[PDB]
Amino acid sequence: NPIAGKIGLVNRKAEEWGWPHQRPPPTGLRRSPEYFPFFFSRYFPDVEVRLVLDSVLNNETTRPIFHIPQDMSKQELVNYLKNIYNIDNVVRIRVRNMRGRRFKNEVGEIKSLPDYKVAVVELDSPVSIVFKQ
Amino acid sequence: NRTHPLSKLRGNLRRNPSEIPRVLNMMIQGVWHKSGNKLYFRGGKPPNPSTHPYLTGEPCPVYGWK
Amino acid sequence: KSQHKNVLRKGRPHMQKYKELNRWQREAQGITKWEQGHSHRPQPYVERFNPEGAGLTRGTSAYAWKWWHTQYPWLPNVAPADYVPPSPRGIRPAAWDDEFADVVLSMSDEEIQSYLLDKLTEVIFAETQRDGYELRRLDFEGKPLTELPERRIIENF
Amino acid sequence: RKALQSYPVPPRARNYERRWSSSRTNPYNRMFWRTVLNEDFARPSFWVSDFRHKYLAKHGMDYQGRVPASPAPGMYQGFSDVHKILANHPKPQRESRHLPVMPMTPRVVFEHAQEKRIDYAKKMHRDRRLVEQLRTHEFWGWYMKLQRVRGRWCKEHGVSSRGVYGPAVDAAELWG
Amino acid sequence: HGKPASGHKVRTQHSRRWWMQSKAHHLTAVPHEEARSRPHFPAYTEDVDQPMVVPDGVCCFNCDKPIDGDDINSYVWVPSGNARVPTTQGYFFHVKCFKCWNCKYRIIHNQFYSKDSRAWCLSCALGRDIRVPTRRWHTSYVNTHRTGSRLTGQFFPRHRHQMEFLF
Amino acid sequence: NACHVPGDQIFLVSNSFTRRLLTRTDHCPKCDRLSTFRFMSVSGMVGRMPYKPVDTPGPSYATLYWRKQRSGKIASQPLNEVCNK
Amino acid sequence: FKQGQGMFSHQLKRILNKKSLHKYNWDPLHMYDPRKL
Amino acid sequence: TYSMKGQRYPAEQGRTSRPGSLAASRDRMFPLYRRNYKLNRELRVLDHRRISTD
Amino acid sequence: VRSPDHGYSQHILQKDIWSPFQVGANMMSYTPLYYDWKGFSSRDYFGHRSGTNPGSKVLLGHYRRDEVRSWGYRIMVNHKPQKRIPKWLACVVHIPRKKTFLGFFLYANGAYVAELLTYKQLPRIIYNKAFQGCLPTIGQTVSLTEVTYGKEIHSVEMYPGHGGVICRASGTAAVVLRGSEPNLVPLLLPSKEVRLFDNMCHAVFGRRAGVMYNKQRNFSKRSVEENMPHRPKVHSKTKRVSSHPAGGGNGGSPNLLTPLDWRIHPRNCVKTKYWLSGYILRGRQYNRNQTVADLKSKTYSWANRDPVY
Amino acid sequence: AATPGVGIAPETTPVKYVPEMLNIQNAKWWNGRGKPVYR
RNA sequence: AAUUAUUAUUAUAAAUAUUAUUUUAAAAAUAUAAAAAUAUUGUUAAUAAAAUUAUCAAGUUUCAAAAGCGUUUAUUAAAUGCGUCGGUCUAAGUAUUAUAUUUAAGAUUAUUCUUGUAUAUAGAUUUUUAUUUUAAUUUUAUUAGUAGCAUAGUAAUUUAUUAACUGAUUAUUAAAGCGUUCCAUAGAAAAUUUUAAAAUUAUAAC
Ligand SMILES: [Zn+2]
Ligand SMILES: [Zn+2]
Ligand SMILES: [Zn+2]
C-alpha cells in the first residue's frame, strides 16, 4: 500500500525519541549519520542472511544459495560475506525475489511469512557440508 | 528508485497523493516500453517499491552506473 | 441488421485503466471531480509542433509546442532567463580605446541609436543599394524625389 | 482498443469499419501501386526534398541531380519525433563528423529485437528437418535391416510368403 | 415499379460477364474460362513435362554466393514462369540477400527490378527516393523456395499438349 | 504423382498414409539413397466412392500426360517385348 | 467483456480506503515575501 | 523451455506440502520441463551488447 | 506555355486547377516555413463542438474537421513583401487545401521566403523593380499613394505596416476609387464595400492569382473532396424535434417560417455587423444592389459615409 | 468529462443560483456532502 | 464472455513432429441429405444472390422504374457528399473566402401571384413585401400523369397470357403531382422470353 498512514509516522517517533515526552533532536542531528537509527545501523547492522542447506549439503556445489532480506542489494551481499564470514571469492551473484511462504494455520487465518530474496552466489572453489550417519 | 535519506540522490518513489496514481501503475501495470520488452513489472509477483535496495546512482552509457 | 457476430470485438483489448485510482485521488485531496471549472480541452502533442518554424518568437521552441496553435506566435520575447540586463559596467572592447570612447561615451543611448539609424540608412542606399537596385521613388521624369529611403523600407531591410 | 501509439511498430493488419464490408486483410498491392507509380503521394520527406530551395537559391538553378539521401549531419536538430518530417529515416546526427550511429530510439531497438527473433525462428525450423532427417532417415536405414533379417530368416524357414500354394501357381504369372 | 431501386449489389459473382473477368491469364494453355476462378490459380502445378528442379550451378542473384542445392528453404527461388536467363531456372536469392541492392532495405510488396544482375527495389530502381519502410527494414516478407511464387506461372497444360487425345 | 530432388515415381495413396502425402521420404533411383519426394499431382483414388464407377475422380488431364510419356510412345522398344513374356 | 476482475481490482478497492497523510499546508505568500521585510 | 506465454495444467504445477505428500515442486517432478533461461536469452532476447552505441 | 492556369479535368467533372510551372511536390515542403498544429476541430473551451457565441469574430465553425491533416503540405506565407528590393520568382508552388498559389521569391537580399503570387507572373524573372513609370509593374509591391485610379491591386494591407489582409484569395483584386479625402485612398474591396485605406499602406500590384477558381474547380470524387474536409451538414428538418424546432412531420416538411441554425440565421436577418471601423465608408449592404461599375464612378469623401448605420 | 451542474454564470456576475435559491436541505447528516460555503 | 464453454486474443515471426480427449448394434419425426428416370415452375406471397464438388459450381436477353458509391437500430428515393443559389461576414484568417442554410450532381429547363415571419422603418406597437423565408386553396403555363399521388378501380383503351386484380404502350380534366420539374439510367426490385444442379407441383422415393 503506497498511501502514507498518519499513525505510522507517530509510531515511528515514539521509538525514535520519546515522542510526547522527550523533545525532538534538532533537525541537523536528524540529517546526520550520527542519528541513532543511522548510528545503530552503521555499527550494529540487523540482517538475516540465512543459508539454504539443501543446495550446500553433501553434494558439492559452486553455487551455494542464500536468502537475504529484500533490501540487500548484490554488492552488499558481497560486502557482507566478505567482512563477516571471510568469504573472499564471489564473482557473480544471482538474485530473485520470492513471495514469502503462505499457509493456513490450524485455526484458519492465512499466516503468510515475511518475504525474502534468494541470492544464488557463485563461489569460485566449490563448498560442501558433510553429514555423518 | 527508492533512496536513502542521507543520499542526495532523488528517486521517483513518491507517496504524495498526487503521485500514488502512477506508483501503482508501475507495480500492477508495469511499463510496456516501445522497444517491445516489458519493463519494471513483467510477470506475477508485483514489486514492493519500499523494499527495494536504495538507488545508488544514475546510469551511464559507457559503464552501467556512475 | 440481425446478426451481431461479436467476434469483431475482442481484438486488441484496451488497457485496464484502473479508474479507482483517479476516483481515489479525488478523495485523497480536497477537490471533487474537477467540475467544469476545467472540464477540459485536448492538450497539444510534441509531434505536431514544428520547432525551427521561423515563427515562435525564437525564444520559445520548447515552451511553445504547448500553449495552442492560436497563441504561440504571440508568446513574447523575454530573455534566456540567464541573460542579465545590459549592465552599465566598465568593460570597454579590447581595442576600441579612448578618444573614441571619450567621444562615443559622450553620446547617450538615444544620441547613439539616432546616429546609428542615419548611418545604416546611409550604409544601405549607398554602396549596398546604388551598387544595383534603387531605394527611393522617382518622379515624372524619373528623378529620385526623396534624398534617402523612407524609414519603413530600412526597417524591414 | 490498445491505441496504436502503444505498439512498438504500428500494427501490420489495420482493421477498419464498414458494416457492409467483411474482409480481414487490408488490400495491399493497391496501396503499393499508388506510391510507387505516383511520386507526389508520399510527403517529400523534407530533407531529400529540401536541399532544393537551398540549391536553387545559392546556385541560381534547379538541382537537376539525384539529391543525397541520409540527411546531412546537423539538419532537424530541434525536432524530436521526426519520422514524418523526414522519411521514416533516423534523426540525422549532431553537426559532427563522427561515424554515423543510429540514435537508439525505442523503435530501432525493437527492430534489433526482430532480426534476432527472425534468426531465432528460422533456426528452430532449420534444425527440425535436420533431426527429422535423422529419425526418418535412420528409421529407413534400420527398417532395411528388418527386411534383411526377415529376408534371411524367410529362406531357411522356407515361408515363401506368397499364399497357401506352391510356386507352381506363381510360375504361370496369371492370377493363378 | 418494384420499389427498392437502390439495392445491395446482389448479383455480381453470378454473371457470365463476371465469369470472364474472374479468370487469371496464367502461363498455361487452358484456353480461357477454364482456369480456376475463386482462388485465381490451381493448387499443385503439375510439371511432368519439365521436372522443375533447382539446378546445381545455382547462385544468389543479389549476393552471388552458391546456394544450398535443395536440402533447405533458406533460398527464395523465384522461377519467373519459364525464366532460363537468370539461371537454368529463375532468379535465386538466399532469404537474407532478398533486399533492394541500391537502397538496402526490403523490397516492399516483393516486386523487384533486376538492375544489371543485382535486384534493385522498384521505387529506387524507378527513381523515387522514399527510402525507409515501416514494418521490417532489412528483410522482406517473402516466402521461401518458390512457395510464394506458385500462385502464378506454368500450370499443367503449358503448350498445345494434344498428345493426350491423339492416338 | 511424386517427384524428388530430381526425379519422379508414382503411387496411389490410401487413407492410412494421408500424413506422408504432401512430402514423402523414398529411395530416389536417380541416386542411391532415400530422398524426400513431393506431390506433383493426383492420380486417382485408393478405393471407390459410393455409387460411382471404377474411375470416380479420374486421374487427371495432367497425370495422364505423364503416363503418355512413360508408356505412351514406347515405339523405341516394342522390340524385346510388347506385352508378352 | 469488461477487463481486470482479478485480484488487483480486489485490492485497489480495499487498500485505497486508507486515509493518506494530512498536513495543513497553508497558502504561500508568493508576491509578499515576509522575510524580506 | 523459452520465456513464452503458455498454458499449464494445475496438477503439473505441483501442490503445497500436503498431509499426505511433501511439497512437490513443479521441477523435481518434471525435470526436463524446467525453462532454461540461458537458452532463452542466448536465442530470443536482444543483448545490451549488440546495440551499445556511444 | 498555354494559359498559365488550366482546368486540368482528370474526370469530365473533376476539374482541379493545374498550372504549368507548378513546382513538383518534392520542391514544396520547406523546413523553416512549415507549421503544424491540431486545429481544435470545432471544439471550443470545454471541447463541446460549437460555433462562436453570437457576438464575436473568432471562428470555430460547428461544421469543421481535419483542418490540419498531418502530412499535408503546409508552408507558411509572408503577406509582408518588402517595398522596392527586387524579387526573383524561383518556383510556383500550388497547395490544394489552401487554394492559394504561392511562389518562392529570393528578394535579392537573401530571403528565400515570399509567397503571394500575382496573376500573369512567370518564374525565374525579377519582379519588384520598377519600369520607367512610378511603380506600374505586375508583382511590384506599391504603396497606395503610387497607384492611380482604376487599376487593380491585391493583398492590400488594412493598417499600414500591419501586413496584407485584404484581397488575398485567388484572382481577387481591390480596385482604387479616386477619393477626395486628404491623405486617404478608397478601395473597392471585392465585397463591393468601399473602405478609406490609408495611402501609405502597401499593396501588391496586379490581380491576385490562379484565376479560374471562381468556378471550374469541382471535385466530385470521394477521395478528392479531402481538399476541403468538413463535418456532415445535416438537414435542419430531420433533427429529432426534441432537439431542433424544425423536425419530424411525417414526410417532407418544408421548414419553419424563420430559419435558424440553433439560435437564428433567418435568411437575410442575422446580419452580424456589430462594430464598424472608422475607415468603413459603405458596407456590403449599402452597395449590394447597385452594380460593380456605378460604385467606381463617384468620388468618395467623408460626406459619403452615411452618419447613421 | 465533468459537470458543475450550476451552469457557468456570466463572467461579471460569477454566482447565480446558490442551492438555497431552491429551498434545498443539505444537512451534513441528511445527504452527507451538503453544507454550503456561503456560510 | 457466471464455466475447463462458441472461442486460433493475429503484437509478431515461421513452414515436413507419424505434439494427440469424444460413449454406442435399429425404424419415427427432425438437423439433414449421398443417390437417382421423367417433368421444368402446375408448387408458391413469390423458382433462379443462395454450402462444398476435380463431373473444377458462372444463366443469357429485352423493356419499364431508379441515384451514387459513402452511410445508418427495425436499412431505405433515410441522412451524407461536389457543383450552382441564398444569406452573413472586411478590427481574427483569404468576400472567386470562410462561416449558415435550402437543395441535390449530369442533361433540358426552371412558369403565374401574394394577406403573414424577416428586412428597411420615422418614440413602438399599427402600418409597409427589390432580394431571402414561407405561401398560391383556380397558382398550374413547361413537363411527365393511375404514378410509393387521399377515394373512385383491377382507371378506359391496346398489346402479353389458353385465362392479364399482372406489367408495358397510346392519350390525359391528375378528388388538390407540377417546375426542382423532366429526361437520360447501372450491379436493385418488378414484368416478359428463355435456359437451369439444388428432392420446385406431379413424387412418394433412409
Ligand atoms: Zn543470397
Ligand atoms: Zn532500394
Ligand atoms: Zn532424385
Query: What is the DSSP annotation of F47-72?
Result: SPPTT--SSSS---SHHHHHHIIIII
Question: Rounded distance, CA A66 to CA A100, Å?
Answer: 14
Pairwise CA distance, residues I144 & C137, whole Å: 13
Q: Which residues contact E13 (CB under 8 A, 6 or more apart)?
A: E22
Distance in Å, alpha carbon of I71 to nearest chain D alpha carbon: 6
CA atoms within a 13 Å half-sphere pointing along the CA-CB vector of C108:
1
* Interface residues from chain G to A (CB-CB < 8 Å): 15-16, 18-22
Residue indicated by cell numbers 544489371: E116
Query: Is residue I160 a contact partner of residue I201, using CB atoms and an 8 Å limit?
Result: yes
Amino acid at D135: R
Using a CB-CB cut-off of 8 Å, the residues of chain A touching B45 are: 97-99
Q: Is D53 on the interface with I (CB under 8 A)?
A: yes
Cβ of E51 less than 7 A from strand K: no
Residues of chain D found within 8 Å of residue F85, distances taken between Cβ atoms: 173
Whether B25 and C18 lie within 8 Å, measured CB to CB = yes
C-alpha closest to that of E105 among E77, E136, E78:
E136
DSSP-assigned states of every residue in chain I: ---SSEE--SSSS-B-EE-TTBPPGGGT--GGGB------TTB-SSS-B----SS------SS---SS-SSS--B-------SSS---EEEEEE-SSS--EEEEE-TTTT-----B--TT--SS---SS--SSSS-STT-EEETTS--TT-EEESEESSTTS-EEES-STT--EEE-----SSEEEEE-TTS-EEEEETT-EEEES--S--S-SSS-B--STTGGGGS-------SSSSTTTT-SS---SS-----SS--SSS---TTT--------SSEEE-HHHHTTS-SSHHHHS---GGGS-S--
Residues of G in contact with A6 (CB under 8 A): 19, 21-22
Q: Checking DSSP bridges between strand E92-94 and strand A117-123, what pairing results, if any?
A: unpaired
CB atoms within 10 A of CB F65: 20
Residue E67 neighbours by CB distance under 10 Å:
22
Chain H, window 12-51: residues with a beta carbon less than 8 angstroms from a chain D beta carbon: 43-46, 50-51
User: For an interface test with B, which of C12, C20, C21 has the most B Cβ atoms less than 10 Å from its Cβ?
Assistant: C21
Place of cell 534538532: A26
Q: Which nucleotide is nearest to I225 (CA to C1')?
A: K82
Q: Are D26 and D14 in contact (CB under 8 A)?
A: yes
Return the closest nucleotide (C1') to the Cα of I220. Answer: K82
Give per-residue burial for D5-15: e unless 16+ CB within 10 Å, then b.
Answer: eeebeeeeeee
- Are B24 and G20 inside 8 Å of each other by CB? no
Across the interface, which of F5, F40, F64 has its CB nearest the CB of E44? F40
Query: Of the candidates E96, C39, E148, which has an alpha carbon nearest to the alpha carbon of residue I47?
Result: C39
Q: Which residue has the cell 513464452?
A: H4
- How large is the angle between the packed helices D117-126 and D129-156, nearest 10 degrees? 10
- Is residue F26 within 8 Å of F33, Cβ to Cβ? no
- Say whether residue C24 is in contact with chain B using an 8 A CB cutoff: yes
Bridging pattern class, strands I17-18 and I194-198: unpaired
Question: What residues sit around ligand 1, an ion, with C-beta below 5 angstroms?
Answer: E 60, 63, 93-94, 97
C-alpha F8 to ligand 3 mean position (Å) = 7
User: Three-state DSSP class for B33?
Assistant: coil
Residue I99 · residue I77 · CB < 8 Å = no
Nucleotide nearest to I211 (CA to C1'): K96
- What is the grid cell recorded at B59? 546510469
Interfacial residues of A (vs B; Cβ cutoff 8 Å)? 2-4, 31, 33, 38, 70-73, 76, 97-99, 115
**Proximity of residue I36 CB to strand K below 7 A:** no
The Å distance, CA of A121 to C1' of K69, is: 71
Residues of chain D (78-107) having a beta carbon less than 7 angstroms from strand K: none
- Residue F58 zone, left/alpha/beta (φ > 0; ψ -120 to 50; rest): left
Neighbouring CB atoms inside 10 A of I22's CB total 19
Residue in I277, I299, I110 with CA at minimum distance from that of residue I197: I277
CB contact under 8 A, D106 and B34: yes
**Residues 158-217 of I, Cβ under 7 A from nucleic strand K:** 158, 165-172, 189-191, 193, 195, 207-208, 210-215, 217
Angle at A94 between CA A91 and CA A100, to 5 degrees: 145
At F33, give phi and psi (nearest 5°).
-175, 160
Residues of E 96-125 whose CB lies less than 7 Å from any atom of strand K: none
- For chain A, the first-to-last Cα distance in angstroms comes to 49
Q: Do chains H and D touch (3 or more CB pairs under 8 A)?
A: yes
Does the CB of E71 fall within 7 Å of any strand K atom? no
G33 to chain B, minimum CA–CA distance in Å? 26
Distance between CA atoms of residues E131 and E105, nearest Å: 8
CA distance I291 to I284: 11
| Chain F residues whose C-beta sits inside 8 Å of any chain E C-beta | 3-8, 39-42, 60-66, 68-69, 72
- Quote the ligand 2 centre to E104 CA distance (angstroms): 6
Distance (Å) from CA B9 to ligand 2 centroid: 49
Task: Give the whole-angstrom CA distance, residue D48 versus residue E127.
Answer: 13
K strand bases under 7 Å from protein CB:
1, 6, 9-18, 34-36, 48-50, 54-61, 64-67, 69-73, 75-84, 86-103, 105-106, 116-121, 130-135, 147-148, 167-168, 186-190
Cell digits of residue A79? 560486502
CA of D18 to C1' of K185 (A): 27
The answer to whether the CB atoms of I29 and D50 lie below 8 A apart is yes
Q: How far apart are CA I5 and CA I27, in angstroms?
A: 19
Q: Is the CB of E137 under 7 A from strand K?
A: no
Instruction: Return chain I residues 210..249 having CB < 7 Å to nucleic acid strand K.
Output: 210-215, 217-220, 222, 225, 228, 230, 232-238, 246
Contact I36, I67 (CB under 8 A): no
Distance of alpha carbon D119 from alpha carbon D129, whole angstroms: 16
Q: Which helix (H) or strand (E) holds A5?
A: none
Task: Assess contact for I236 and I255: CB atoms under 8 A.
Answer: yes
Interchain proximity B61–H54, CB inside 8 Å: yes
How far apart are the CA of D132 and the centre of ligand 3, in A? 19
CB contact under 8 A, G1 and C24: no
What number of other Cβ atoms are within 10 A of residue E146's Cβ? 19
Residue I33 CB in 7 A reach of strand K: no
d(CA I208, CA I139): 9
In terms of phi and psi (left: phi > 0; alpha: psi -120 to 50; beta: otherwise), the region of I71 is left
One-letter amino acid of F53: P
Report CA-CA distances (Å) from D11 to E135, H40, I279: 8, 25, 58
DSSP tag of E120: E
E100 annotated as ligand-binding: no
Segment 37-66 of chain B within 8 Å of chain A by CB: 45, 47-54, 56
Q: How many Å apart are CA I61 and CA I59, to the nearest integer?
A: 6
Q: Which of C48, C142, C152 minimises the CB distance to I38?
A: C48
**Axis-axis angle for helices D117-126, D106-115 (nearest 10):** 10
Tell me whether residue E103 is annotated as binding. no
Residues 104-163 of chain D within 7 A of strand K, judged by CB, are 114, 117-118, 121-122, 125-126, 128-129, 132-133, 135-136
Element (H, E) at G30: none
Q: In angstroms, how far is K88 C1' from D63 CA?
A: 49
